[PDB]
Design an enzyme around this catalytic site. Structure first.
Site, PDB file in Angstrom:
ATOM      1  N   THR A  28       0.801  -1.228   0.000  1.00  0.00           N
ATOM      2  CA  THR A  28       0.000   0.000   0.000  1.00  0.00           C
ATOM      3  C   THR A  28       0.828   1.270   0.000  1.00  0.00           C
ATOM      4  O   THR A  28       1.963   1.295   0.480  1.00  0.00           O
ATOM      5  CB  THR A  28      -0.920   0.090   1.238  1.00  0.00           C
ATOM      6  OG1 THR A  28      -0.124   0.213   2.425  1.00  0.00           O
ATOM      7  CG2 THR A  28      -1.776  -1.126   1.342  1.00  0.00           C
ATOM      8  N   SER A  29       0.230   2.333  -0.526  1.00  0.00           N
ATOM      9  CA  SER A  29       0.834   3.661  -0.520  1.00  0.00           C
ATOM     10  C   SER A  29       0.836   4.178   0.912  1.00  0.00           C
ATOM     11  O   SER A  29      -0.137   3.979   1.644  1.00  0.00           O
ATOM     12  CB  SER A  29       0.013   4.597  -1.410  1.00  0.00           C
ATOM     13  OG  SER A  29       0.770   5.718  -1.820  1.00  0.00           O
ATOM     14  N   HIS A  87       7.459   0.620   4.585  1.00  0.00           N
ATOM     15  CA  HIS A  87       6.903  -0.609   5.138  1.00  0.00           C
ATOM     16  C   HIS A  87       8.035  -1.447   5.717  1.00  0.00           C
ATOM     17  O   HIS A  87       9.202  -1.304   5.333  1.00  0.00           O
ATOM     18  CB  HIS A  87       6.158  -1.397   4.055  1.00  0.00           C
ATOM     19  CG  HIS A  87       4.845  -0.790   3.679  1.00  0.00           C
ATOM     20  ND1 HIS A  87       3.805  -0.670   4.581  1.00  0.00           N
ATOM     21  CD2 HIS A  87       4.399  -0.266   2.516  1.00  0.00           C
ATOM     22  CE1 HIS A  87       2.775  -0.103   3.983  1.00  0.00           C
ATOM     23  NE2 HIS A  87       3.102   0.147   2.728  1.00  0.00           N
ATOM     24  N   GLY A  88       7.697  -2.323   6.653  1.00  0.00           N
ATOM     25  CA  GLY A  88       8.680  -3.274   7.143  1.00  0.00           C
ATOM     26  C   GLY A  88       8.077  -4.497   7.803  1.00  0.00           C
ATOM     27  O   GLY A  88       6.849  -4.635   7.901  1.00  0.00           O
ATOM     28  N   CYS A 129       6.762  -1.011  10.111  1.00  0.00           N
ATOM     29  CA  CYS A 129       6.236  -2.088  10.955  1.00  0.00           C
ATOM     30  C   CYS A 129       7.310  -3.096  11.303  1.00  0.00           C
ATOM     31  O   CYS A 129       8.298  -3.247  10.580  1.00  0.00           O
ATOM     32  CB  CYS A 129       5.078  -2.796  10.283  1.00  0.00           C
ATOM     33  SG  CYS A 129       3.680  -1.700  10.175  1.00  0.00           S
TER      34      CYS A 129
END
Lengths: 232, 4
Positions: A28-29, A87-88, A129
């Site tokens: 996701t953006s 993100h992660g 994350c």
């Protein structure tokens, strides 16, 4: 007592701002991340860091950037700062096209691999994350090559990290506010502790999805620093 | 509010 911070330069602040991901990844953006990136740029400029912003880097460009930066001559610089906005998962942050191991990134700056930063604080600030758990909260003369690193993670290991699409991420918002307020009087660990309290107390998610509603967050500081760090 |  304290790190020498009166070199002619405070050092570099590298900000990697990943907002949009390749469609094939299905990621996701990250709406709101530009607010974080602008806030960080100003905050660190005010602390006299040489800020370099990079947006939407592939996993290969991330690794190549960090390698290049580790190869620079930092002899005249007091410290080094890298902020990662993506993100992660636990141990991992995402390039636009796939994952990079955080240890791969940070290892370029090991005391034996970046000599002009040996004995100087290397600071990694991570908004991403670290898994998918949700916090429901509760009503209330050699030196080691791994020495002089600090990793300031937005969230506990295993857990999601929260980002507001309008205001930016809870962690970066709070980090910038505490740096602005306290960089002229508190040591860095104490600033980060104030960040921990701000995130933990002032934020709670709101969602129409019950699974994601009324959730909490606590940042997590990893310090392998050997001295106190003052920005003034 | 969204997660990363």
């Amino acid at each position: 007592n304290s790190y020498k911070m009166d070199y002619p330069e405070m050092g570099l602040c590298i900000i990697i701002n990943n907002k949009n991901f390749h469609k094939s990844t299905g990621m996701t953006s990250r709406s709101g991340t530009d607010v974080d990136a602008a806030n960080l740029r100003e905050t660190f400029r005010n602390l006299k860091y040489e800020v370099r912003n990079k947006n939407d880097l592939t996993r290969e460009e991330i690794v190549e950037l960090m390698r290049d930066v580790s190869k620079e001559d930092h002899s005249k610089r007091s410290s080094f700062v890298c902020v990662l906005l993506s993100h992660g998962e636990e141990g991992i942050i995402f390039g636009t096209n796939g994952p990079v191991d955080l240890k791969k990134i940070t290892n370029f700056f090991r005391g034996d691999r970046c000599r002009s930063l040996t004995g100087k604080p290397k600071l990694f600030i991570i908004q991403a994350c670290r898994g998918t758990e949700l916090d429901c909260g509760i009503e209330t003369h050699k030196i080691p090559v791994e020495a002089d690193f600090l990793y300031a993670y937005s969230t506990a290991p295993g857990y999601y990290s929260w980002r507001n699409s309008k205001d930016g991420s809870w962690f970066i918002q709070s980090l910038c506010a505490m740096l602005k307020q306290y960089a002229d009087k508190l040591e860095f660990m104490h600033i980060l502790t104030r960040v921990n309290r701000k995130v933990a107390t002032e934020f709670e998610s709101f969602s129409f999805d019950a699974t994601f509603h009324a959730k909490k967050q606590i940042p997590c500081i990893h310090s392998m620093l050997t001295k106190e760090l003052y920005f003034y | 509010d969204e997660v990363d």
